Structure formats: structure tokens, C-alpha cells
Amino acid sequence: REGVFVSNGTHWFVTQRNFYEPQIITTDNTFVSGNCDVVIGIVNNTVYDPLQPELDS
Amino acid sequence: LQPELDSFK
Amino acid sequence: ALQIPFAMQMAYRFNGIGVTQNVLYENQKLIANQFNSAIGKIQDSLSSTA
Numbered sequence: 587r588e589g590v591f592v593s594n595g596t597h598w599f600v601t602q603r604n605f606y607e608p609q610i611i612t613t614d615n616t617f618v619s620g621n622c623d624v625v626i627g628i629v630n631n632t633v634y635d636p637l638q639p640e641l642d643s
Numbered sequence: 644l645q646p647e648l649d650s651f652k
Numbered sequence: 653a654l655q656i657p658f659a660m661q662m663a664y665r666f667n668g669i670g671v672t673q674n675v676l677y678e679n680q681k682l683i684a685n686q687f688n689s690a691i692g693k694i695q696d697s698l699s700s701t702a
């Protein structure tokens with residue numbers, strides 16, 4: 587949604603362009619559109635969903 | 644989210 | 653100077669004109685051909701003795 591994707595070697599994160607404030611990838615701050623079939627440079631990774639911990643909790 | 648869980652557990 | 657790969661360098665510029673960056677990656681090939689195609693015409697515009 588804002589900023590760019592970064593990784594400290596193997597753990598991916600999201601941070602704003604003008605500062606290094608890594609955060610866990612989440613659906614709220616990463617709008618989803620289309621499928622990962624045409625974008626060049628896609629990277630396989632899981633996106634944490636805040637609802638699942640709250641589900642049945 | 645809290646009221647939603649309370650309304651339907 | 654901070655290195656930024658050109659793939660999403662354009663993407664932020666798209667965000668600067670009120671366009672979601674998702675369209676660019678879906679249209680990366682079209683934009684590249686369009687940009688290069690424009691470079692073809694601009695060269696001939698000056699070379700046309702005008």
C-alpha cells in the first residue's frame with residue numbers, strides 16, 4: 587500500500603521509502619490485485635492475516 | 644472487532 | 653544517491669499521479685514498448701530537417 591518491500595537477507599518486511607522502519611507483511615497495508623502470473627520479480631512468501639489469531643479466540 | 648465477536652461467539 | 657531498481661522506480665512515479673502502482677507491473681511490457689517506441693519518433697522528429 588505504501589513504501590517498498592525489503593528483506594534482511596531472508597525475512598521480508600515493508601518499510602516507507604524515506605526511512606527504514608521494517609514491519610511484518612500484512613493484508614491491511616498491502617492491497618491485493620490480480621494474480622502473481624504477470625508481475626516480473628514476484629517473490630513467494632506468506633502474508634500474515636490478523637484475523638486468523640482472532641478467529642476462534 | 645470486539646463487539647463482532649461478542650455479538651456472535 | 654540510493655540505488656532503486658527501475659522496475660518500481662516508475663511505480664512510485666505512478667503513485668505520484670494518482671495511479672495505483674499495480675497497473676504498471678501488469679502493463680510493464682506495454683509501457684516499455686511504448687516508451688521505446690516514443691524514443692523512435694522523437695529521434696526522427698529532429699532528423700526530419702525541421
Ligand SMILES: *[C@@H]1O[C@H](CO)[C@@H](O)[C@H](O)[C@H]1NC(C)=O
Nearest residue numbers: 593594595596597598599608
Ligand atoms: C532478519 O530479521 C529478522 C526479524 O527479527 C530476524 O529474526 C533475523 O534473525 C534477521 N536475519 C536474517 C538473516 O533473517
Ligand SMILES: *[C@@H]1O[C@H](CO)[C@@H](O)[C@H](O)[C@H]1NC(C)=O
Nearest residue numbers: 625626627628629657658659
Ligand atoms: C535480474 O537480472 C539478472 C541478470 O541481469 C537475472 O538473472 C535475474 O533473473 C533478474 N531478476 C529479475 C527479478 O529481474
Ligand SMILES: *[C@@H]1O[C@H](CO)[C@@H](O)[C@H](O)[C@H]1NC(C)=O
Nearest residue numbers: 622623627628629630631632
Ligand atoms: C511459488 O509458488 C508457486 C505456487 O505455489 C509455485 O508454482 C512456484 O514454483 C513457487 N516458486 C517460485 C514462483 O519461484
